[PDB]
Amino acid sequence: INIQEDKLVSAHDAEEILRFFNCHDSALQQEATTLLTQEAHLLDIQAYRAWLEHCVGSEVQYQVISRELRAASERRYKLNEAMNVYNENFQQLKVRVEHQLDPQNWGNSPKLRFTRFITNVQAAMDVNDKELLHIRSNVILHRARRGNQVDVFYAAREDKWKRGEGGVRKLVQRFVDYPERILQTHNLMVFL
Amino acid sequence: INIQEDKLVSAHDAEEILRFFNCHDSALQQEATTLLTQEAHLLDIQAYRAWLEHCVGSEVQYQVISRELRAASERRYKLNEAMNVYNENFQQLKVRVEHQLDPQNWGNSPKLRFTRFITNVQAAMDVNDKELLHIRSNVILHRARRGNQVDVFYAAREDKWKRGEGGVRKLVQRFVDYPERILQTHNLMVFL
Amino acid sequence: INIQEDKLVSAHDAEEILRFFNCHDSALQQEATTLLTQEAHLLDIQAYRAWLEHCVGSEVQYQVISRELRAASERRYKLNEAMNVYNENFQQLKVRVEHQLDPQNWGNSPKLRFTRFITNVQAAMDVNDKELLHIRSNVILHRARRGNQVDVFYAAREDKWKRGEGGVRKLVQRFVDYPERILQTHNLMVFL
Amino acid sequence: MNYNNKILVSESGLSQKHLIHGDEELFQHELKTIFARNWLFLTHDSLIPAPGDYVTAKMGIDEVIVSRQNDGSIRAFLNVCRHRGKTLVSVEAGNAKGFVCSYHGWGFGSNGELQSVPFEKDLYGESLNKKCLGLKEVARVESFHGFIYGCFDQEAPPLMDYLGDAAWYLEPMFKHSGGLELVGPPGKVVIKANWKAPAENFVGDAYHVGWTHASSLRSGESIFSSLAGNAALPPEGAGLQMTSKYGSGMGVLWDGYSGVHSADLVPELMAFGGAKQERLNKEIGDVRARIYRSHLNCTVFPNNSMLTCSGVFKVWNPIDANTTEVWTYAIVEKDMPEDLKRRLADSVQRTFGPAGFWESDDNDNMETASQNGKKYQSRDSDLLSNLGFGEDVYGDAVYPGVVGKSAIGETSYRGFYRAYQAHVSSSNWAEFEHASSTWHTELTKT
Amino acid sequence: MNYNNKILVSESGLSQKHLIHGDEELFQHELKTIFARNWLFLTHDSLIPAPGDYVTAKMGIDEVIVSRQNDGSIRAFLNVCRHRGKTLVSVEAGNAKGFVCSYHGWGFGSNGELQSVPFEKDLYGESLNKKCLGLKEVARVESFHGFIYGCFDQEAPPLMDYLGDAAWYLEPMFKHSGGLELVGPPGKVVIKANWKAPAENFVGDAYHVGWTHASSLRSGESIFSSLAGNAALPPEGAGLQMTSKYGSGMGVLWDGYSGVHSADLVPELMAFGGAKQERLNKEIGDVRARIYRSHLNCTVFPNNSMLTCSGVFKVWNPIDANTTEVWTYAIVEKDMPEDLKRRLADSVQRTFGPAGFWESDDNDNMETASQNGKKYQSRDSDLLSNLGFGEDVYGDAVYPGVVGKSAIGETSYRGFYRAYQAHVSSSNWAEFEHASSTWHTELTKT
Amino acid sequence: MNYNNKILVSESGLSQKHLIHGDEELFQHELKTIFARNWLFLTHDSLIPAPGDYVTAKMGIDEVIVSRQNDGSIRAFLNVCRHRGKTLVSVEAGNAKGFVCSYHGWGFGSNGELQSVPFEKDLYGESLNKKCLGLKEVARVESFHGFIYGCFDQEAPPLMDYLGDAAWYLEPMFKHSGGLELVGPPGKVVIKANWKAPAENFVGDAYHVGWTHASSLRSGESIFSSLAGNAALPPEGAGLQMTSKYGSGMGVLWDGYSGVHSADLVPELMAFGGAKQERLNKEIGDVRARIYRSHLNCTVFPNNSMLTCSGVFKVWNPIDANTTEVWTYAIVEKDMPEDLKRRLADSVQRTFGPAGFWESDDNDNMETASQNGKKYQSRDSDLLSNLGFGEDVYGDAVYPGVVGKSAIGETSYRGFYRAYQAHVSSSNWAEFEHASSTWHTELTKT
Ligand SMILES: c1ccc2cc3ccccc3cc2c1
Ligand SMILES: c1ccc2cc3ccccc3cc2c1
Ligand SMILES: c1ccc2cc3ccccc3cc2c1
Ligand code: FES
Ligand code: FES
Ligand code: FES
Ligand SMILES: [Fe+3]
Ligand SMILES: [Fe+3]
Ligand SMILES: [Fe+3]
């Protein structure tokens, strides 16, 4: 993409496009699809420990940002552009998982209901690290609780996955730039 | 999964996970995807008779439950845990189809509009019945009517499909545990 | 389908079903999936010029209708059944793209956020034109802006795609019959 | 609006202002004069049979905990902590000796008493008068053959008296059958209708069945299926209608024991009901044994409805003037075989549950009628309920209450709305009684 | 709020309290004093040309059925059953001799009469006075060259008189062109704006065009495109503004016959309009023939707007103070070739329809201006409409009404809001007339 | 409701009517008597350090632009165009010399002045008095050590006086530490709670921590973790509670400098705070140096809260009685290493941000307590805040304000609600003062 001509496109977004247009491997896309479907299934049934063990690498960065609304023409104001809703290493994810499983987590009774819809999967091996798989996918995440509370989350995920213990591919980075600035879902206490 | 460690996971959910992690066949997943996409297409265009003829086995159980909200720690109260929104044999589905097609079904004029989004397809042959295919998938179902009525349904489907008349695979069981306890969609008069 | 028996099915819908049931090619479905995922990615990052260059044929008809609500039994009243929300040739799409990119499009600051979910892809070559690919797919389109504005669009797309400059398959017709009669999304200013 | 003077329901219940289904100020006023004043359905013995069993229920817009006590009685309390007002119980059913608040950990007994306060000694010393800090208790809780109702107003009539002439019709099924069980959990669905729209429909509306339910009648198999599309009017003497002083009422469709159930259940049901009726003839007499196996569409004022024999049990829980949360249970006779009970329960939900195809027929009717009550040109318009007026009787030798001796009419609407108007214009039970001292005369005029 | 005394619009219409776009009590009051009182757009002859043809339309928040009678007239009725208030018609257009209610099957004629009641003989006998149970009829229904308006108030002026000085400007396009057709069905979109925000914008707002529509002007091809980004002010004598006693008003942009249409239609349109103007010079004179092919941005009070030549036809249907359902039709000249009509219709929707790129430019402007009227520090603030005040005239020898002889100003806002205030503070048409007996003097002060 | 007479808060602040969290009329009344009257948090110097820097902020339901002027001062204006009321700025932060309206292109300075009007000469001539058309300015804007607050009421006390006895507790961290920076941008999340629910919780609620946050305490690593599940009561002398005349108040937990931060930050923080405290002993004395590194849970009346040391900074922005938009920033000490600041900022959001696992524990508590205030049987019920009553002091030799010398109590609730009631029943600041002339006596009774 030429971002001087395509005026609305960020440098970051143009870089990510290039990665997938480049060298399509259908088998990789299918592997990525399996990986993500299985991850979503574990999360949906609230098998959080299994998710950590089977899907999350020890060196993970799990990050979801919220970007401040700024003028499209803005070029002077230069302070922190975003905050981290999540910016978790493995130990921090574990803390969150223990919080979910704690029997005195009162908000988890009656049990929550999650349903995830994963779409638009693309996969490409890193050019310079032959063992690093880039996977892009979008998620709709539906959380229902307490009779009439329903929250629906929408996001694009930029992941890096790499083979770990036992040759199992595990998530080593997830980056989400959350599209809604003001959350209308009570909180963002879901693993996107 | 160890459900003694993964405290939020039900025995049923752990069993279903095992089934798909076991023996992945990519061709089966692709067949399942076709099957479900075609089923959704027939339903979306309100070809209910075609759906019965082409997608639904004569021995079908079509079941959608609503589970009463109980304490995560509950261990004494033992009455009926759920009710059946749907629990239909073939003849009962046919009754529902005839109700949809009846020219004095006033609620069907002006004609409804359905759009289904099927995702997260997994497929695995049964271990003990070589001709029974387990298929899991999630659905978002959008129903629009009467200018400004819009209802969106979200669910995970646990299906069994088996080859029937003419070697065509047909639905022999669908089980849905509806995630929202109190429906905010006027009714659940949609085939999930 | 027999539309005399399946009373709710339109002639148009029955014709379109026939096209996909006929001759399934798995490789074509996978090509179609790639095509649409890439198109959605370009649109999501607001690379509108790239979308035109890479995805849209010079002979395109891009059409989204809204159909007036009429009685299922209606057989006398014969005036225009629908209006065109979109009915664009290439030049008209270009006008819309320039409007999006114009630095005095005040509604585009702060920058909008789009996320598209493409599902239910089916693909079939035209019977009589060997180079015309029919592709059907459904889209959920999430647009977020201005802190707390969130609009979600739902649609089935009937596309024709054909190889153009450089052998790249490009969209030559998109037809959408928008399922909601009265829009509750402020406008329909999104490329479905 | 001045509810003392405003004529919302015309004399003899012949009409009602359409605004009653849309006006939010009136809805707020109903919270006080209908819901806080009258008997409301909570649960059944079969759902909380053992000590410590509880469920949550709505009473108007309030939520209550309904709990089986150690001594076998049932007490109900506001589901609201006495400290800073947090909802105490977040589940629908369970078994417990008490309820602990998740905010600051205050612990209440199943009997509502404030039993523990964390670190009470160190924090409050002896200064917290726990005896005065029990959960706010529903003043009145009574049972009609296992069906448990509550009332916030200590001055209300006993439940039996409140049922008035309707009790006589319910007793063959509710008492002489050996008793009924409620099969839970209920379906729960929100509809965009005023609570009165389904309430009036169940109390009194046989007229709609052939036309509204044409498709369900035709498709669905059932005993009442000759009515589909108004193809046939029930014969004379096919039924009757009744109403009562405190607003409860019902239709009676003679012999329709299989009700809305599809032909897959018709033979079995008609056999079972007929057999029981044969035994009951000897005990309660032929007419009442026949009533047992006759289809009753009833509303227990204000917002609990049922179809006996069909086994449909409804609560129209109010949210606002155009929003109602519909709870749907199945009722079964205790002595039915368990397999029949299971199938009957499923059939109730199949027809009238969240995906109930019959129930779906009623949606637009209820929703649009309700929403139209907000529309400017309709607020002051008159909803008509005059069918059969001037042919009703009172004090009949066989059938008690204000009775129309025809299957199809608007008798029960008139009694429902006469009671409604008397409540809305009254400040307490004494005033309602004063406003109701000629209730049956008003209903049988001309 | 006391609407008799509250100054919501200042003298000469120079300003309005911002709360007018946000206050729900005022919205409710408008239902009575604006929407129930004034003429509202329903449909066009071209949409219900044959006997039995009907459409549904909103009139304020009420819904009506508008039906072509056997004798060629049009009658309109509330879309509400006279029995228990169910919405009668669930479709937008069709052809029928009558409408049957889906609740209890009551059948009404296309003429509103209650024609049948199921089993009337067996149920009602001779007691139902069907003659008194016809659908509630819109008192007044009149046509302006095929454009059909309704009014619930029998005391209203005839439609022609109500149009006042605006009719003279509309007639060349609406009458002398040979007549217009409305191309349906309309687009329908809900916006989060008060109905007055788009109404005021179309009646009177040329000032916004260059800045608000900068991107659409620049991208989109059109004749008025020199204005993009306020790059150029139209020349003196480029147009004028007018307003009238009953609140209708418009801008006139001389010669702009291709309107907002992209350059793909400009040559064809400018040829067609010029040719017709040449013939019309002989019939109606040069000035009025020029008006025919000049771009008029008009609001027919209260909530119907249009852009002639562009062919944009709007109804701003009110829902609440910050919600409006926008209906968008295309208007075409009957004698245009059919292919041009089709392309013109598509171009109207392309620019101003649900995905209208011009219309989209206006969204935030209308929505935020409306929502800000709810904000505490803005309720009592003054929206300004003083541009051109003290330069308007009345009784001009050529151009009738209160007229500003400049393309850009706020003349039409002042007349719109003078009429609005006179209605909101009046109980009936007589009082409005009394409040309006010096309307033009008030508008031309200083 | 008559707010002059209605007792919404009982004497000494011992209880409040539950309706205060649900009643929309009272919410509207708070817009006037709480939000338009009192000091509200806008931003920090660190977010608009340079000339032309601005942010948008809410003040009640109003939105303002807060802008750094050329002379180094800060001025704030309504984010509403003075022409037809469009929202001027659609972004959250930036740098500009002015703001142009997207409707008709009016240009306002960073100083609020109407600087340009498109084509002013041709359109308005010399008739537009731009000097009178500046943006509506927030009357009062003052700084507390870089933290910028606004007040619409010119009669308010200076911010310092308004902080009253709370300022003494804040100064060691806000002033003597070398100063704090606010790390933006904030998280923003809507919760279905009344703004008072989180406000009261932060001002005064140590009691809930062990039980509400049991899971976060247990999982999450932190210094205060002995409290999990009420396993342990803090020792005597673990802290204190204070409140003040104008309603601000806080808890003090001695020495808890690592606050809610997980063990990954505990060593580093406890080292950093201890080192600074050692230097501060010499400057401000041992008690105040200890306060610097003690955990303060504070609400600056009405709706700004914070946890010092934890670094949590909140704005509870009101939307309606059961809707609040929660803004969450991190506060850091300027002289901390940048890497620590970054990690501290992330940890604030990790615990108390949009996906803050601690914050999530509070959701149901706040939301249900608020929503229950709408429920009929609870409106007139009494929320209790009597813990520690009769043990508070005033005028202590060491710790100023009304003080409870215990870590856990309801002292700060009582002062918050005494101030709230005095405002709600008063028409202006003079009346509040008159209603508050014995404030501390009222709080220390018995
Ligand atoms: C009110 C609501 C539902 C009803 C359903 C019925 C089904 C069969 C026979 C009579 C009925 C009467 C009814 C009356
Ligand atoms: C109000 C609303 C839309 C308008 C659109 C216009 C387009 C071209 C030229 C003048 C216009 C005036 C307008 C006035
Ligand atoms: C109110 C709200 C949150 C709080 C959080 C705390 C965390 C650690 C120690 C004391 C706290 C007190 C608090 C009081
Ligand atoms: S609100 Fe229940 S213990 Fe405090
Ligand atoms: S409501 Fe229309 S026939 Fe009864
Ligand atoms: S509303 Fe801002 S310039 Fe007109
Ligand atoms: Fe019914
Ligand atoms: Fe415009
Ligand atoms: Fe907390």
- Asked if D221 and D351 touch (Cβ cutoff 8 Å), the reply is no
CATH number of F1-35+165-446: 3.90.380.10
Instruction: Please report the atom of ligand 6 found closest to the CA of residue E207.
Output: 4
CA atoms within 13 A on the CB side of B159: 27
Cα angle: A119, vertex A123, A129; to 5 degrees: 150
Instruction: For residue D424, give Cα distances in angstroms to D1, D317, E378, F409.
Output: 11, 18, 39, 45
Cβ density class F135-146: b for 16+ within 10 Å, e for less? bbbbebbbebeb
CA atoms within 13 A on the CB side of D80: 31
3-state helix, strand, coil in chain F (%, to 5): 35, 25, 40
SS3 E314: strand
Instruction: For D100, name the nearest residue in chain A, comparing CA atoms only.
Output: A106
Which of C62, C64, C102 is most worth mutating to test chain E (most E CB atoms within 10 A of its CB)?
C102
Of F182, F189, F180, whose CA–CA distance to F356 is shortest?
A: F189
Of A182, E118, E95, E253, whose CA–CA distance to C73 is shortest?
A: E95
Q: CB F78 to CB E378 under 8 A?
A: yes
Residue nearest to atom 4 of ligand 6 (CA): F104
F312-320, strands of its sheet edge to edge: F180-191, F323-333, F312-320, F304-307, F295-300, F249-253, F239-243, F402-404, F393-394
Instruction: For residue F45, give Cα distances in angstroms to D243, F51, F67, F168, F308.
Output: 73, 11, 10, 21, 18
Of E165, E138, E131, whose CA–CA distance to E154 is shortest?
A: E138
**CA of D305, nearest ligand number:** 1
Cα angle: B100, vertex B103, B105; to 5 degrees: 50
Distance of CA E20 to the CA centre of its chain: 19
- B1-192: which CATH topology? Nuclear Transport Factor 2; Chain: A, (3.10.450)
How many other CB atoms are there within 10 angstroms of residue D104's CB atom?
23
Residue with tokens 């501390």: F440
Residue with tokens 């604030």: F348
Of E280, E337, E335, E327, whose CA–CA distance to E306 is shortest?
A: E327
Q: What's the token pair of residue A117?
A: 């819809």
Cβ density class A20-50: b for 16+ within 10 Å, e for less? beeeeeeebbbbbbbbbbbbbbbbbbbbbbb
Of D247, D164, D147, whose CA–CA distance to D199 is shortest?
A: D247
Which of D377, D378, D379, D384 is most worth mutating to test chain E (most E CB atoms within 10 A of its CB)?
D377
| CA atoms of E427 and E444, how far apart (whole Å) | 26
SS3 E203: helix
Rg, C-alpha atoms of chain C? 18
Q: Are strands E312-320 and E323-333 parallel, antiparallel or unpaired?
A: antiparallel
Q: Which amino acid is at A160?
A: K
Of A58, A46, A143, whose CA–CA distance to A100 is shortest?
A: A46
Residue with tokens 């003083």: E386
- Asked if A57 and A159 touch (Cβ cutoff 8 Å), the reply is no
| CA atoms of E42 and E186, how far apart (whole Å) | 12
- Asked if F285 and F177 touch (Cβ cutoff 8 Å), the reply is no
- Ligand 7 geometric centre to CA of B86 (Å): 20
Binding residues of F: 81, 83, 101, 104, 208, 213, 362
Q: Phi, psi at residue A30, to the nearest 5°? A: -70, -45
> What does the domain layout of chain D look like in residue ranges?
1-35+165-446, 36-164
- Asked if F90 and C145 touch (Cβ cutoff 8 Å), the reply is no
| CA atoms of D308 and D253, how far apart (whole Å) | 10
Is there a binding annotation on residue E132?
Answer: no
Q: What's the token pair of residue E174?
A: 């609406």
Residue F428: its H or E element: none
Nearest to D361 among B79, B107, B188 (CB): B107
| CA atoms of D420 and D34, how far apart (whole Å) | 8
Touch between chain A and chain D (3+ CB pairs, < 8 Å)?
Answer: yes
Of A83, A96, A93, A81, whose CA–CA distance to A174 is shortest?
A: A93
Peptide bond into E49 cis (omega under 30): no
SS3 E162: helix
Instruction: Please report the atom of ligand 5 found closest to the CA of residue E104.
Output: 3
Residues of B in contact with D94 (CB under 8 A): 70-71, 74, 76-77
CA distance B25 to chain E (A): 45
Extract the runs of DSSP E, i.e. beta strands, from E138-178.
Answer: 140-144, 147-151
How does DSSP assign E325-372, residue by residue?
EEEEEEEEETTS-HHHHHHHHHHHHHHHSTT-HHHHHHHHHHHHHHHH
* Count of CB pairs separated by less than 8 Å, A with B: 97
Q: Which amino acid is at E44?
A: H
CA atoms within 13 A on the CB side of B12: 4
CA distance D390 to chain E (A): 10
Q: What's the token pair of residue F385?
A: 């805040």
How many other CB atoms are there within 10 angstroms of residue C66's CB atom?
27
SS3 A155: strand
Mapped to the 3 state alphabet, what secondary structure does chain D carry?
A: CCCCCCCCECHHHCEEEHHHHCCHHHHHHHHHHHHCCCCEEEEEHHHCCCCCEEEEEEECCEEEEEEECCCCCEEEEECCCCCCCCCCCCCCEEECCEEECCCCCCEEECCCCEEECCCHHHHCCCCCCHHHCCCCECCEEEEECCEEEEECCCCCCCHHHHHCCHHHHHHHHHHHCCCEEEEEEEEEEEECCCCHHHHHHHHHCCCCHHHHCHHHHHHHCCCCHHHHHHCCCCCCCCEEEEECCCCCEEEEECCCCCCCCCCCCHHHHHHHHHHHHHHHHHHHCHHHHHHHCCEEEEEECCCEEEECCCCEEEEEEEEECCEEEEEEEEEEECCCCHHHHHHHHHHHHHHHCCCCHHHHHHHHHHHHHHHHCCCCCCCCCEEECCCCCCCCEECCCCCCCEEECCCCCCHHHHHHHHHHHHHHCCCCHHHHHHCCCCHHHHHHCC
Q: What's the token pair of residue A182?
A: 């003001």
| CA atoms of A115 and A112, how far apart (whole Å) | 10
- Ligand 5 geometric centre to CA of D221 (Å): 25
Distance of CA E199 to the CA centre of its chain: 8
> What does the domain layout of chain A look like in residue ranges?
1-192
Q: CB D102 to CB A106 under 8 A?
A: yes
| CA atoms of D282 and C148, how far apart (whole Å) | 70
Residue C42: its H or E element: helix C26-44
| CA atoms of E416 and F84, how far apart (whole Å) | 15
Residue with tokens 């914070």: F306
Question: Does residue F145 carry a catalytic annotation?
Answer: no
The CATH class for the domain spanning E36-164 reads mainly beta
